[PDB]
Amino acid sequence: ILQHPDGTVLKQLQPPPRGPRELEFYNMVYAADCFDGVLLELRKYLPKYYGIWSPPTAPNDLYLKLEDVTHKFNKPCIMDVKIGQKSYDPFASSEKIQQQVSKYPLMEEIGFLVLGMRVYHVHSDSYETENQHYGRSLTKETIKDGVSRFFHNGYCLRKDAVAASIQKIEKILQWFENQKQLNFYASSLLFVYEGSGGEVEVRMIDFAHVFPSNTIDEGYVYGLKHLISVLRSILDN
Numbered sequence: 001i002l003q004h005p006d007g008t009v010l011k012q013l014q015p016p017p018r019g020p021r022e023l024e025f026y027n028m029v030y031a032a033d034c035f036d037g038v039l040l041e042l043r044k045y046l047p048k049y050y051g052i053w054s055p056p057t058a059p060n061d062l063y064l065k066l067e068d069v070t071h072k073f074n075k076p077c078i079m080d081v082k083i084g085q086k087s088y089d090p091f092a093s094s095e096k097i098q099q100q101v102s103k104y105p106l107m108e109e110i111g112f113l114v115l116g117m118r119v120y121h122v123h124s125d126s127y128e129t130e131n132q133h134y135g136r137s138l139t140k141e142t143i144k145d146g147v148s149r150f151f152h153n154g155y156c157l158r159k160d161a162v163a164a165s166i167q168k169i170e171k172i173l174q175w176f177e178n179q180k181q182l183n184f185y186a187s188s189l190l191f192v193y194e195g196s197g198g199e200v201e202v203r204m205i206d207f208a209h210v211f212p213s214n215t216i217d218e219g220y221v222y223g224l225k226h227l228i229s230v231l232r233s234i235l236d237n
């Protein structure tokens, strides 16, 4: 992710097949002839898409030009959460499945994984960052506190941001419960709140493993439900 002053990010396409698949996903969704009600509603929950972009002198070098979801914040607190029971897709090899499950073998049980967070702390005027090893170290016993950390400014628990996050996740959940045409593997929710009142972004990102489907995305729904449940419990802290 390259953060651009104009309020966009440039995401470099991942190597094939993943990068191409994410391009086709955005292209399908934001198809200017699309009157598919499911895909039109989905746009709300994605970064705005500005199409494929390459450097003027380098058409080989493919990026997606996306809305920077953090742009309108002063001191954004950002958390990336991978959603689902499986982070491998329907066409993964045995080795690939093993690779994916071994990265975090608790994915089936919990249904989400914190990829990272950046949390602004008021009283130190500084950011605490957690990397992928943080979320991958969380278990059933520590997931509530693991998530809570995102919402601590170093004086209070931001229950406003927690409650707002539940409400925005709920709308994404409602979308998923009204579509049986896409299944999403190894995709994430990007959470943003203001670290400097109930002012939150919750957006879907990372679409290298989105596939056509005939069914409810049961794994994704499970993940959203469990995440909402964790966030709900945090409101009782």
Ligand SMILES: c1cc(OC2CCNCC2)cc(-c2onc3ccc(-c4nn[nH]n4)cc23)c1
Pocket (backbone or CB within 6 Å): 001, 003, 009, 011, 047, 066, 067, 068, 069, 070, 078, 079, 080, 115, 116, 117, 190, 205, 206, 207
């Ligand atoms: C700043 C930081 C940021 O977080 C990084 C930091 C490391 N831990 C979490 C990931 C994300 C963003 C951001 O803002 N808008 C975004 C739109 C799409 C994407 C995106 N990423 N992967 N596929 N799409 C990322 C986006 C901006």
